[PDB]
Paper text:
When they were initially discovered, type III interferons (IFNλ1-3) were structurally and evolutionarily classified as members of the IL-10 superfamily of cytokines. Further investigation, though, revealed that they are functionally interferons (IFNs) with distinct roles in mucosal and innate immunity. While predicted to be structurally similar to IFNλ1-3, IFNλ4 shares only 28% amino acid sequence identity with its closest relative IFNλ3 and has a distinct biochemical composition resulting in IFNλ4 being one of the most positively-charged known cytokines (pI = 11.3). We next use protein engineering to overcome the affinity limitation for structural determination of the ternary IFNλ cytokine-receptor complex and determine the 72 kilodalton (kDa) structures of IFNλ4 as well as IFNλ3 in complex with IFNλR1 and an affinity-matured IL10Rβ via cryogenic electron microscopy (cryoEM).
A The structure of the IFNλ4 (red) ternary complex elucidates the mechanism of IFNλR1 (gray) and IL10Rβ-A3 (gold) engagement. IFNλ4 engages IFNλR1 with higher surface area and has fewer polar contacts with IL10Rβ. However, IFNλ4 forms more polar contacts at this interface, with eight compared to four for IFNλ3, featuring unique involvement of the Ser185 residue on IFNλR1 forming three hydrogen bonds with residues Pro37, Arg38, and Ala41. While the overall topology of this interface is similar between IFNλR1 and the IFNλs, these chains find themselves in closer proximity to IFNλR1 on IFNλ4, leading to a 38% higher buried surface area (BSA) at the IFNλ4:IFNλR1 interface (1740.7 Å2) compared to IFNλ3:IFNλR1 (1260.1 Å2). Ultimately this leads to an affinity of 191 nM between IFNλ4 and IFNλR1 as measured by surface plasmon resonance (SPR), more than 4-fold higher affinity than the previously published 850 nM interaction between IFNλ3 and IFNλR127. While Tyr140 remains in largely the same place, the Trp143 residue in IFNλ4 is in a flipped orientation compared to IFNλ3 but in both structures is buried at the interface. There is the same observed “pinch” on Helix A of IFNλ4 formed by Tyr140 and Trp143 as with IFNλ3-H11, with Tyr140 forming a hydrogen bond with Arg38 on IFNλ4 and Trp143 forming a hydrogen bond with the backbone oxygen of Leu35. Comparison of the structures highlights differences in receptor engagement and reveals a distinct 12-degree rotation in overall receptor geometry, providing a potential mechanistic explanation for differences in cell signaling, downstream gene induction, and antiviral activities. During structural refinement, however, we were unable to resolve the structure of Helix E of IFNλ4. While this region of the protein is uninvolved in receptor engagement, molecular modeling reveals that this highly basic region of IFNλ4 containing the amino acid sequence KRRHKPRR is predicted to lack secondary structure unlike the corresponding region of IFNλ3, breaking from the structural symmetry of the two proteins.
Numbering used by the authors:
A (entry chain C): 23 to 127, 147 to 179
B (entry chain A): 20 to 214
C (entry chain B): 6 to 201
Amino acid sequence: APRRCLLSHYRSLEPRTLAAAKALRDRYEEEALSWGQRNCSFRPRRDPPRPSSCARLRHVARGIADAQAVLSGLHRSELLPGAGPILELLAAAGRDVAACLELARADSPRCRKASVVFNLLRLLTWELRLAAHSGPCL
Amino acid sequence: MVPPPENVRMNSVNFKNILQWESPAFAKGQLTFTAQYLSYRIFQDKCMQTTLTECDFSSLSKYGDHTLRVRAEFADEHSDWVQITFCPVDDTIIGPPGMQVEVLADSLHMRFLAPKIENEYETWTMKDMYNSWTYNVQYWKQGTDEKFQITPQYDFEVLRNLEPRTTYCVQVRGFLPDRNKAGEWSEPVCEQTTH
Amino acid sequence: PPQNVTLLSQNFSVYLTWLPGLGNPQDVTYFVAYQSSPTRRRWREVEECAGTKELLCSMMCLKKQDLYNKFKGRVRTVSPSSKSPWVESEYLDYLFEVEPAPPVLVLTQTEEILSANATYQLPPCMPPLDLKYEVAFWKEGAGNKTLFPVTPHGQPVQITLQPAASEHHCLSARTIYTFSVPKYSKFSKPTCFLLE
Ligand SMILES: *[C@@H]1O[C@H](CO)[C@@H](O[C@@H]2O[C@H](CO)[C@@H](O[C@@H]3O[C@H](CO)[C@@H](O)[C@H](O)[C@@H]3O)[C@H](O)[C@H]2NC(C)=O)[C@H](O)[C@H]1NC(C)=O
Ligand SMILES: *[C@@H]1O[C@H](CO)[C@@H](O[C@@H]2O[C@H](CO)[C@@H](O)[C@H](O)[C@H]2NC(C)=O)[C@H](O)[C@H]1NC(C)=O
């Protein structure tokens, strides 16, 4: 049987998960400060939101996938630990978002990794909350 | 030769995961147990050489599925792995929410308190976890046992026009309208309305 | 130069405050700029505080501030003769250091039901966050405070009104902010009022 949409429970994330994400971002910041500034710009640029529901689900899915890839690759090298809870929640959220979507119908890698690490909190708290309020594609 | 564990279950109420199993019919001696959980494609030994027949897994995240796997060991010798899968966000059950019932005249006031997760703060309850949450209530005059159902929109409910000097028994539970998964009817509390 | 440049948070808002050093003239104005934790090279300057003699300047609503990420501020003393070097401030992360404030309790009474709906004055543009509030209810001489279970923002706390004489019942509320760690606010001023 096809899996039902259970995005409604992502409106309020677990406090310990958010604390772990904060610790991970702090560790990444400490690593960036220890080795010195990075030439490539990694400003957490604003992402233009849209009122469309299915487009919002697709965008949050893309963000989830990119963040999961970057954090898993970083964790493979064991540069910074504590990404376990974040990685498993990213996998779960991506699985649920993809299930809902299917049921309804030369920049350096360093600055990209910094950007996704910085925007991880915004994606977990803002974009995921809007996606949960959105539900399945209309 | 060591018999494997039988009847392995994962009892999870309010995300209080406890994996239990039944000890097997080993001929004699001591039969210990070893339970592990899959993480990053390698099993981590949650419990090793434990005498108890159960082990808690509440340390694992409430997000994402897990694979639990326990065997029985007889000193150097060992037995075959018995393994289950467990999704805490879907395979858990919601405990009976707390009830505050106060009866005045012919009116019964009802306050519902969401079940609490033992690993989180008192502010983050099961209601916060399952955001699309509702309270269901069934009440009946004592003995009649005619379940009248009322579904409050908030954590308060006021039943009115109660026939005096007759006890009414009520129960509450946590319903999840989106997935259609009910919780556990709270203890049936019986109140005698004031004359 | 301002001696004590400090970036703090009060009532869901971020304020940069400072007191200056002796010897400066009485015609000095203040120029203030904010810097985010990422892309530290950027030093965006705050227009509402630009050239203002005020020693306090709000930071919650700025040109482009990601409350998710950490940010700091710097202040300088500007005079027609010369401008002092900037004095920076320690970093502040909003969602992990925002100080909440008690709400305003809109009191609606029924014949036997009293509602204590909480209204909040949140900054126009801030990240949505848990706003559960605890309500303390008591009598003018009882002393002991009846604490009700926390309820989310937008949910009136409901109090049964047991019939009795008209007494001066007092009420108050406290904001509980639980983004990642519960941050309790202070109990508001009691709204003491007669109840029949
Ligand atoms: C108790 O106080 C809360 C305070 O939040 C009241 O809830 C608020 O009710 C107003 C309507 O009177 C809502 O405004 C509406 O917001 C939507 C966006 O969600 C907007 O599109 C509408 O045009 C309208 O402006 C407001 O959102 C809502 N806030 C919350 C947090 O629920 C509530 O009505 C009061 N009374 C009771 C009985 O709860
Ligand atoms: C403002 O800054 C001044 C200077 O840094 C602080 O003055 C110091 O206060 C501590 C308090 O224990 C004393 O031990 C020091 O002797 C003071 N002088 C110096 C040079 O450190 C002051 O505390 C700060 N705060 C306020 C409210 O004035």
